[PDB]
Design a protein around this ligand. Structure first.
Ligand SMILES: Nc1ncnc2c1ncn2[C@@H]1O[C@H](COP(=O)(O)O)[C@@H](O)[C@H]1O
Ligand SMILES: Nc1ncnc2c1ncn2[C@@H]1O[C@H](COP(=O)(O)O)[C@@H](O)[C@H]1O
Lengths: 209, 209
């Protein structure tokens, strides 16, 4: 019931993305086109592009589905489309490789539908114990699984982290102090980036509570 | 020869994106799909999506061309594609509306090729004196033109700001000191986010110097 959670700051993001870009520079892979995996790869993609000097960024939206009986995970491109990337070197970027299902799909999808000269993959982080596929480049290796709460994800993650606590209440009333307490107890965050009261207001607006 | 330049921080970006999202909430425009304009709108798009709770983000790459004799500006979609967005409300996002050429193209392109039920435009900033087109939503109105140096653009902008000084030199100069001095004199930046020596090394790697 405890989930190890790490709050990632903008500075750490900048540091990771820059470190990622440096590895690509040092490998002298000449990138013409970045394909960001939406939504997680949008920010890292922009930052890496700034460091490497890439002007062409495209994105594909990859969904993550779980079959509720079998619990089978499946990644899936939504709003799929084709463009002609022949004669381009492509770099695919995402935030973090966990199982590697997303980058595996992205690579396969790009090879088949964009037809680049060459394709490489890159993520800010990479979880060694969990990854079936390892990205060509990564800034930081993670040897112990944890949920990484990125600065572009603060609202969404907190909304979910709060909901995982609320769905075990046993009282259709919501006590905020109890909530804050459980947040510290379950996740180890005493000062969430977004105050839990704002989260609750937004959860109501979204009809989650 | 002096260019007014404002260095925008991550916190200001967060503040702007959140303020932008709040306007959209208050207007009760129910967004199904965000179309980010690459590259400038990628980050703001992600952040606004986090605040509003939007899961579907697509992007289109808009280029900005100038004809060198006539000086005619033209915005252009690169790697154009079509997807079916019928029955969706779309929000198009970019960093800043200057002339409004980009959002005008984006809106026209999205209406014609994605065919959404409805399309609105949004930028973090909006320059009143320059904009032919005004976005449906903006976080901050600017009444006096300035170059906004965004945190996802620090390398690129500094590379250009340095180049604009170097292309008036004297004789293949070096000296990180005169450069730094001119930077302060021309732009008013005493501490660039990226150190100028860092920029120079990267300029050589890119064969700009
Ligand atoms: N440990 C984690 N922390 C934060 N985000 C994650 C984590 N694992 C997976 N994700 C998200 O899930 C997506 C898919 O990762 P994967 O399991 O490699 O397909 C990534 O793009 C991340 O946005
Ligand atoms: N004053 C400015 N500061 C920073 N970026 C700008 C500025 N004006 C234009 N841009 C960039 O140029 C693009 C086109 O703006 P527009 O002139 O409205 O077509 C925007 O997406 C910005 O990324």
């Amino acid at each position: 019931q405890k989930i190890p959670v790490k709050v990632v700051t903008w500075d750490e993001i900048v540091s990771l993305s820059t470190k990622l870009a440096e590895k690509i520079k040092a490998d002298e892979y000449n990138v013409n086109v970045i394909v960001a995996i939406a939504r997680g790869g949008l920010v890292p993609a922009r930052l890496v592009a700034d460091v490497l000097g890439v002007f062409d960024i495209l994105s594909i939206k990859i969904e993550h589905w779980i079959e509720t009986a079998s619990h089978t995970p499946e990644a899936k491109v939504k709003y799929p489309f084709k463009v002609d990337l022949s004669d381009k070197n492509v770099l695919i970027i995402d935030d973090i490789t966990d199982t590697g299902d997303s980058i595996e799909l992205a690579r396969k999808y790009v090879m088949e539908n964009f037809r680049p000269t060459e394709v490489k993959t890159a993520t800010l982080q990479y979880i060694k114990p969990a990854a079936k596929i390892i990205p060509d480049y990564y800034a930081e290796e993670i040897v112990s699984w944890a949920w990484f709460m990125y600065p572009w994800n603060y609202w969404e993650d907190e909304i979910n982290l709060v909901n995982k606590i609320l769905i075990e209440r046993k009282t259709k009333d919501i006590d905020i102090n109890e909530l804050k307490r459980n947040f510290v107890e379950s996740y180890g965050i005493e000062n969430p980036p977004i105050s839990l009261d704002k989260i609750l207001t937004e959860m109501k607006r979204r009809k989650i509570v």
